Design a protein around this ligand. Structure first.
Ligand SMILES: N[C@@H](CCS)C(=O)O
Ligand SMILES: [Zn+2]
Length: 753
């Protein structure tokens, strides 16, 4: 009998209960007691759900109030002194570290979890760090194991392992020379103790996550797995299942081929081809957990293909030593497809969310164990077959237009220096031209009118009028502040990816398909279901209106192809690359419509352009850098030489050059040397002058200072002046003075040239 296994379950709740209750606690509507009661109920609910599906190996310690890496830092005493000064309970210390503390500590750094859309809180270590088991609050992994046990649910605790925990961490402000991995000897006894306590509590297996194995690791780091796991493994601890996901462990195979652990987990959804070699290093007695149900996407699994993968593993190591698993934690997928009320049934039949993936690992497990599941297999085969044959997936026009992609389509009529000549003639911008990034802060009357417009209570014309008033206000604001290259404020836009996805063929949307991004901030990504195309103008009306009321140049504002791809659920039947190129072609028609309508300054926002960087150096990485840049160039390369193309980012120098934008903005407000990278590079650059997440106002002199610093490493002829990013999240008085000061700073320099 082949067991089924779930590496972690999303914890936000089927109706976002975690968000409401944690925000109610932070706001003061709810007590901490209510907070913990509600966590307990979610955990219990998710455990019963997995037991009822028939999952054998069910996780615990996967729950978190904020972030599981942060939970380990609390638990192991990786707590910087700055967070202890305020008579705080452990759970408020956790929230302090996680989200800062309004008396003003900054939150610890949030960092992207590999190439997932989740963010963790970076473990932060000092020379003074003293690792130990904080048993004050309770020991969360032991307490949550015992809870699940009292329900009659045996679970497998999940903890991030010592190597990855340290390696993914950073030396604190006060210890810039400390190498985190050098702490391995201090933290090992603390892991050992925790594992003893879990065994004592009744844990027979522990899932110990070592995802850094899918990265490029120094040889000196690779040797530490043998050191860590020789120390951890013994009779007085649970069996350890060393767990990896998101990538290829093969280059690091030497580091794990002689480890005393009870088994391994590998991701055969991202890297099925690694199976033969990883299977071959299993010792007699070791188990192989085969990750064949994707933890990061929303597509119904192909039961025949998944079973085949599992069957290849059984061949190599025997049926008794194989486990059917989710490829990673289901943290990265929405909770329940059954909550969806709007999707057409044909499309929904192609999806499985977290709750459904429980059923998938169970059926696949039954199948290779020899139980009769033909009805499920045939139902699955039909879903897969309907999807591959649907006209939605295969658009002939789009397929042909892909055949036109070549380097000529991704090259502008002339190089920057010629282009600059024609742009100077046409716009005659001053030195130190000033701009902003696009968004300005919205009114109450806006959201209310959107809602009314969605209900048909005001007409299309009435709503248009309200948007244009907002645009009018914003433009007049910018004029009077003396900005040089204006924006329309994006008041019509909810979201920089959904706004576009809704207007493209090939996308579907959910009502409830929420995934945690960080803390209590959740996203509901679009889904790319098929071939993408643009049926009509998406942004032209608003931009034409904005330009029609000022003589300043107005930026069109688009989100680039790679950002749209990376912030959506992608298709799994075609490559990232093909999806980006189709998006680039679709955006090229929009650029063409803008330019044709007189919007001849156009910004393409690519904040996530690097987020898909393949996790290892090699062919796949260099291909990615090439196609990401090509897909941007395909969108922007059909314009006239005098059309000024901008790009915004928030980051490899040379990748940025390969985009060949006339003008760049880059989140900044930080070593000077980085800027010296662009000195003999002709295109123009605006390095963000202020943090838009703060309400604080820099002085004129502040700005003058900041500019003069950059100016020592970068010529005045190329320098734009702008904020790090949009201003959608700020208040109007912060905005007014900050932009005033920014621009009068600029003019002071303008005058001395
Ligand atoms: N144009 C967008 C950029 C966000 S990355 C804005 O100003 O908000
Ligand atoms: Zn931005």
């Amino acid at each position: 009998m082949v067991q089924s296994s779930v590496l972690g379950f999303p914890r936000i709740g089927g109706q976002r209960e975690l968000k409401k209750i944690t925000e109610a606690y932070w706001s003061g509507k709810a007590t901490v007691e209510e907070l913990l009661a509600k966590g307990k109920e979610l955990r219990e609910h998710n455990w019963k759900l997995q037991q009822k599906a028939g999952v054998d190996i069910i996780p615990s310690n996967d729950f978190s109030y904020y972030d599981q890496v942060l939970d380990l830092s609390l638990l192991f005493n990786a707590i910087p002194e700055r967070y202890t000064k305020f008579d705080l309970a452990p759970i408020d210390v956790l929230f302090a570290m996680g989200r800062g503390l309004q008396v003003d500590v900054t939150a610890l750094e949030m960092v992207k979890w590999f190439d997932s859309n989740y963010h963790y809180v970076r473990p932060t270590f000092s020379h003074s760090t003293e690792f130990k088991l904080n048993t004050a609050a309770g020991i969360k992994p032991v307490d949550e194991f015992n809870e699940a046990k009292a329900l009659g649910v045996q679970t497998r605790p999940v903890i991030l392992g010592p190597v990855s925990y340290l390696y993914l961490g950073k030396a604190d402000k006060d210890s810039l020379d400390l190498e985190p991995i050098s702490l391995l000897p201090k933290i090992l006894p603390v892991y050992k103790e925790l594992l003893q306590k879990l065994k004592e509590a009744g844990a027979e297996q522990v899932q110990i996550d070592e995802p850094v194995l899918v990265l490029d690791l120094p040889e000196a780091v690779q040797s530490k797995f043998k050191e860590a796991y020789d120390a951890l493994v013994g009779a007085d601890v649970p069996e350890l299942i060393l767990t990896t996901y998101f990538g290829d462990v093969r280059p690091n195979l030497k580091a794990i081929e002689n480890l005393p652990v009870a088994g391994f987990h590998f991701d055969f959804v991202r890297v099925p081809e690694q199976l033969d070699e990883v299977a071959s290093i299993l010792k007699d007695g070791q188990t192989l957990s085969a990750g064949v149900v994707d933890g990061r996407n929303i597509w119904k699994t192909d039961f025949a293909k998944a079973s085949a993968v599992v069957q290849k593993a059984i061949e190599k190591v025997g049926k008794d030593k194989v486990v059917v698993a989710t490829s990673s934690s289901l943290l990265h997928t929405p909770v329940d497809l059954e909550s969806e009320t709007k999707l057409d049934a044909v499309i929904k039949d192609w999806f499985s969310f977290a709750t459904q993936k429980l059923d998938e690992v169970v059926v696949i497990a039954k199948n290779v164990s020899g139980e009769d599941v033909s009805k499920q297999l045939e139902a699955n085969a039909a879903s897969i077959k309907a999807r591959s044959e649907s006209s939605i997936t295969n658009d002939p026009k789009v397929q042909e237009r892909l055949t036109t992609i070549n380097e000529a389509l991704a090259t502008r009529k002339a190089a920057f220096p010629e282009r600059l000549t024609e742009q100077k003639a046409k716009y005659n911008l001053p030195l130190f031209p000033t701009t902003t990034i696009g968004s300005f802060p919205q009114t109450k009357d806006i959201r209310i009118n959107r809602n009314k417009f969605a209900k048909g209570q005001i007409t299309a014309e009435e709503y248009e009028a309200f948007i244009n008033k907002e645009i009018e206000t914003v433009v007049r604001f910018q004029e009077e502040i003396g900005l040089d290259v204006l924006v329309h404020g994006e008041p019509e836009r909810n979201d920089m990816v959904q706004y576009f996805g809704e207007q493209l063929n090939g996308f579907a949307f959910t009502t409830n398909g929420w995934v945690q991004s960080y803390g209590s901030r959740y996203v509901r990504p679009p889904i790319i279901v098929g071939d993408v195309s643009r049926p009509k103008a998406m942004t032209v009306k608003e931009s034409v209106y904005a330009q029609s009321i000022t003589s300043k140049p107005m930026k069109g504002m688009l989100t680039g192809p790679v950002t749209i791809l990376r912030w959506s659920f992608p298709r799994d039947d075609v490559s990232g690359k093909i999806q980006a190129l189709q998006l680039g072609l679709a955006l090229r028609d929009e650029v063409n419509d803008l330019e044709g309508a007189g919007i001849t300054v156009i910004q393409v926002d690519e904040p996530a352009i690097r987020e898909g960087l393949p996790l290892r150096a090699g062919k796949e990485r260099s291909d990615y850098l090439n196609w990401a840049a090509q897909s941007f160039r395909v969108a922007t390369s059909g314009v006239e030489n005098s059309t000024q193309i901008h790009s915004h980012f928030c980051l490899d120098p040379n990748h940025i050059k390969a985009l060949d934008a006339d003008v760049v903005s880059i989140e900044f407000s930080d070593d000077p040397n980085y800027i010296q990278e662009f000195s003999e590079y002709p295109n123009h650059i605006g390095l963000g002058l202020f943090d838009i997440h703060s309400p604080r106002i820099p002085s004129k002199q502040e700005f003058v200072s900041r500019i003069e610093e950059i100016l020592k490493v970068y010529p005045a002829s190329k320098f734009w002046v702008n904020p790090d990013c949009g201003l959608k999240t700020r208040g109007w008085p912060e905005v007014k003075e900050s932009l005033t000061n920014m621009v009068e700073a600029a003019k002071e320099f303008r005058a001395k040239y």
